[PDB]
Ligand binder design. Structure first.
Ligand SMILES: Cc1ncc(COP(=O)(O)O)c(CN[C@H]2CONC2=O)c1O
Length: 364
């Protein structure tokens, strides 16, 4: 009975939502996309939302919409998914990777500020695993230096920072990928407070078409989200508190269970927030545990327990090792060789939970 690290919470409502779209005959971008955009604005408190085919796509068009290109620099942690790094590079710009906090895996204001230059054109913090990054300090930096802040909120649907939802203000990009808090298999949405920026996003995700009858205004890509998938995201969005509460509950058990184990969970940031609990990451230091991270991952899999790796730092991947050979980021590297994500999803049962815990004990 294989127990994967994640499973989508698909029920009768997701199917019903698809049926209504299929029966209506309007299966691609239309009314469901509009509803999903209005709902994300309602959810966050922000004024505009542009639905897209993936959070990667949203990152691409957001950076593109800023006019980022050749010669421009973009600050981002290396501890994040490679999509962001790839979008900066593919646009012709230079990614400037900085280190993250050793226990929360989040980009600090200090690391960001030391890398700013006159070529910096965007700063991309990541709300890691469900927790929020230091927005006040990050936005201050953004306002002081005149640099746009584009928040990576792929793990943060349901996250709040100091009493305010991630995405309320500024620009934040969310993900509907299959193992994320809410899903439509693949999809995403860019929430922003700037109308001109929003208009550029709408046009860039749909061939650069626009009214000057629509015609190409400036070449764009094809990143529209079908209504079919948007209707699934809408049904999932309606269950967000319940799904997140089930994730939080399981995090607590893990937390409790970790007291008796040698594995070290990440630290909660110190500012006030609400954790979406997208992932439950543990560090596996060979010395402290007597088992390495890779060995534990392989061990757990023998027992039919799947684990995730979030993430093998971008700068340690082939293309990036070869392009930035002298780049060193200790906290990032230290964590990259030790982290792994244990099973965490809304439908996980205690048979599942407890099974994971009696496999870890076996191991330790
Ligand atoms: C931090 C981060 N940013 C962006 C993306 C890209 O999102 P899209 O898949 O929507 O383009 C992911 C991938 N998502 C997940 C879900 O599982 N773990 C991952 O890294 C991510 O983790």
């Amino acid at each position: 009975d294989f127990l994967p690290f994640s499973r989508p919470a698909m029920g009768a409502e997701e199917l019903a939502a698809v049926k209504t779209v299929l029966d209506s005959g309007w299966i691609t971008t239309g009314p469901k996309n509009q509803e999903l955009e209005a709902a994300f604005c309602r959810l966050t408190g922000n004024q505009y939302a542009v639905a897209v085919s993936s959070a990667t796509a949203g990152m691409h068009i957001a950076l593109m919409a800023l006019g980022i290109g050749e010669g421009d620099e973009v600050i981002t942690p290396s501890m994040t998914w490679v999509s962001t790094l790839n979008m900066i590079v593919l646009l012709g710009a230079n990614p400037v990777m900085v280190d993250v906090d050793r226990d929360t895996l989040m980009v600090t204001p200090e690391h960001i500020e030391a890398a700013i230059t006159p070529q910096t054109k965007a700063i991309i913090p990541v709300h890691y695993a469900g927790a929020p990054a230091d927005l006040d300090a990050i936005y201050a930096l953004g306002e002081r230096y005149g640099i746009p802040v584009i928040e990576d909120a792929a793990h943060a649907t349901g996250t709040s920072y100091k009493g305010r939802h991630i995405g309320a203000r500024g620009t934040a990009i969310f993900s509907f990928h299959a193992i994320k808090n809410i899903t439509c298999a693949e999809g995403g949405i860019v929430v922003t407070d700037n109308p001109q920026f929003a208009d550029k996003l709408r046009s860039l995700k749909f061939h650069g078409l626009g009214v000057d009858q629509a015609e190409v205004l400036a070449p764009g890509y094809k990143y529209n989200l079908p209504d079919l998938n948007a209707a699934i995201a809408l049904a999932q969005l309606q269950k967000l508190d319940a799904l997140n509460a089930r994730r939080a509950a399981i995090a607590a058990q893990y937390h409790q269970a970790m007291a008796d184990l040698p594995f070290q969970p990440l630290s909660l940031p110190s500012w006030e927030h609400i954790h979406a609990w997208h992932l439950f990451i543990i560090r596996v230091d060979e010395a402290r545990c007597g088992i390495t991270r890779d060995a534990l991952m392989a061990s757990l899999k023998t027992k039919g327990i799947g684990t995730g790796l979030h993430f093998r730092a971008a700068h340690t991947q082939k293309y990036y090792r070869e392009r930035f050979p002298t780049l060193t980021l200790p906290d990032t590297e230290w964590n990259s060789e030790r982290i792994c994500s244990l099973p965490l999803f809304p439908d996980m049962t205690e048979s599942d939970f407890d099974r994971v815990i009696t496999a870890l004990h076996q191991i330790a």
